[PDB]
Design a protein around this ligand. Structure first.
Ligand SMILES: [Cl-]
Ligand SMILES: [Cl-]
Ligand SMILES: [Cl-]
Ligand SMILES: [Cl-]
Ligand SMILES: [Cl-]
Ligand SMILES: [Cl-]
Lengths: 205, 205, 203, 205, 206
């Protein structure tokens, strides 16, 4: 119960409806934050990879009951109905991840960018993994990283993959983080037992 | 909260380990039924399609709270650790589905076969879909069907698809059901606004 | 050695009877003029192609198939299907059909189970052995026809393919009840990986 | 510069336009042979596999400058413009292959069918590969094969795969060629270090 | 017609340990192509984003396809190339060729630290509308620090016909500032009415 949960949803959206949608979604966020007990949300545009241009919504819950309450909010929500009736937004992926305890100094600052990284590794290496993450915590915080969350995808066609989400105020902070990170022993160790199979930048809208 | 939830897990398993697996799984099932509040499980091999020969595990919960307790049960389970440590079972897919109220007389008979059907349709046709399912209930029951569950995928690459699960005592009962169903007006009607994109048989082990 | 041609098309649900009509005109044509040793036409009941329609042709030689191709170009029935815009052929492959020790029936099946597997080409003989050692599993429990060979074309070229005709689904159940608990089957599982199994309903 | 090149283009084409397409394509071929220096072309429908019913165009050049002159002919060609403007043809794949010197007696006979075979193998086995092809050159010629070209895909998602193209006057010649080939020592040896991942028949239109 | 140039893009998966060795081998191989094949430059880097994150990418620029043919003849004779292939540590799994069309953009000679590749689907009949938009936004890029810009269509591969844009940058800050301006520019919003971006990725020059 020290474990938390993250819902990640991805939709293709007509380009014209993008700004409309971000405004509707902040309304929909306040509703989840106030009534479903959501511990924050993020909404942004995926900037990189094959889903570039898709929009992503991220929800944080302490327990899966929270998400279940969020599902009851959807059914009753006018803003949600409007987006689905528009015919301009198509949800094509939704998956849930655990969020595990890390030794990382969380900041309250809303990030402008998020880097999600996904990797394949044995479930038996879960602790090795967690140690590397904690050993490089200062690579991130020192170079401007705001938030760090880490866990495993519980659902979908990448079930079991480890996932890392890191919030930044700028792309400079990303560059400076990755300069240090790639020349750090714990990172080079990670690369002996974990295969990164995805890395992408989201722009918070 | 009239809604229930189904978790579906699929894994590739060495043919030799199949028997041992089933035996370990029924122990793990007892665990979930008694301690996680699981309202039943199914374990079988996928008989058809591209995943022919993979094994599938199905869990039913009234709430997502239930599934969270089940996750806590995993971390502590020796039976579960053994399966994972064997290197003979690889989980490559897990998704969650809703289960909606349907006008169908459920039997408690353990099914010998399950048929999963998955379809694409607008979320705005949700009620037309459910009405058709209810108008055809007698096709199923009359020809031997044991159980009928229905809802949408909450997670995964097919998020949003409608999903139908039906339990059967025999393949004859499947033949007789489909003989009637294909020639039923409500079915013909469903096929004007829903496209089946997958159908498969599971053999309960 | 014989040959089997398998063609798969996605068809609109509303076009399904027109399709069944135009295909019956077409089979007679191939049987009588191409030297086709039979055809089957059905809907794929399972898998990710559930709802597609499948057409199966049997030839003793590929020269038979070449004649069939020359019958297509002149066929009105074929022209109508393609001009309909309601049928989209998306797969066509050719398979060998090897001699097996199985007693064939003339009874038109109601269902066909297709099973496809990956195995070394050096295991060809062991494979055929297993298939002949479990011939009785099928015939005992009602199987009508059995064909076995390798895909000569397409993305699964080289895979072994097994086609079995049945009068009912009860017969499939009883067959697989016996088959899965047979020694030769468990041995086949040591060197062959089934990567696909599907039921066709003969229309 | 003993190496030649082969461009292969694949398009989906409305069935009704097929005959017109063919007529326009032999015009466009004349233009390439006469002005681009193309050393022959072939146009046909793909009879098997997942691209059954697509049309394919094959161009032969001694040098890539040839193909660059071809590109210059396109921009000027009315025939080509018309095909594009029709909305009836959609080029969805084009790749380039080397064509390596083989000890095979080439015929000038217009083929009726072509069989393309594609295989995966080490680049360090290039010579063992070519020697097999040369040892079996009689299997093809003796049984009716007209032309044989062999090389590696330079471009595409199958870059590096070996590609064989063999022309035939009829299906019987294909069947007789494979009856002999499959039971030849050099062929059996090729299969110890090469994996065929595709084989398909093209009907010359 | 001969105002068109050509770009070869090759992508390989490489063991992490071999990546530094590889970059050093590759600069030798580049000299060879620049001096003997007539290559008008090369770029070598790691793909930082997308499903190919961690793969290495090699980019070659030629005025003519004859240039690339000479390059192919250089490979067969190159010891550096043989070593890489014999290592068993590098696997080329994609190579495609793109046109490079004339654009109204002030090219810099500064070696970039990052490249952004963008790929889009659009009718071939919109080719000129496309080029106009690219030229109308040229200042967005140059103003905010972009070094080079190349634009054209994939000639080969499973995305044959897609438009492809490659832009060089000195830093990630320059990318951020470029995209801040670009996304709020009329010509960009117009481009998005007839072109669908289906891929965008950052390469780090090694
Ligand atoms: Cl990372
Ligand atoms: Cl099974
Ligand atoms: Cl159904
Ligand atoms: Cl089977
Ligand atoms: Cl072959
Ligand atoms: Cl862009």
């Amino acid at each position: 119960s020290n474990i938390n949960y993250v819902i990640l949803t991805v939709a293709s959206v007509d380009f014209s409806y993008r700004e409309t949608m971000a405004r509707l979604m902040s309304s929909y966020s306040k509703d989840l934050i106030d009534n479903a007990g959501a511990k924050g949300t993020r909404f942004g545009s995926i900037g990189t990879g094959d889903h570039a241009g898709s929009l992503i919504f991220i929800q944080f819950y302490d327990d899966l009951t929270g998400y279940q309450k969020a599902l009851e909010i959807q059914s009753k929500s006018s803003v949600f109905k409007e987006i689905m009736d528009s015919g301009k937004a198509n949800i094509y992926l939704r998956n849930i991840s655990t969020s595990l305890p890390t030794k990382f100094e969380q900041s309250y600052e809303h990030p402008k960018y998020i880097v999600l990284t996904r990797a394949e590794a044995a479930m038996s290496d879960k602790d090795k993994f967690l140690n590397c993450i904690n050993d490089t915590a200062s690579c991130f915080k020192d170079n401007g990283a705001l938030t760090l969350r880490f866990g495993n995808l519980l659902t979908g066609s990448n079930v079991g993959n480890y996932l890392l989400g890191v919030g930044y105020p700028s792309m400079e902070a990303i560059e400076k983080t990755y300069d240090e990170l790639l020349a750090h022993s714990s990172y080079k160790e990670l690369m002996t037992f974990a295969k990164v199979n995805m890395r992408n930048i989201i722009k918070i809208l």
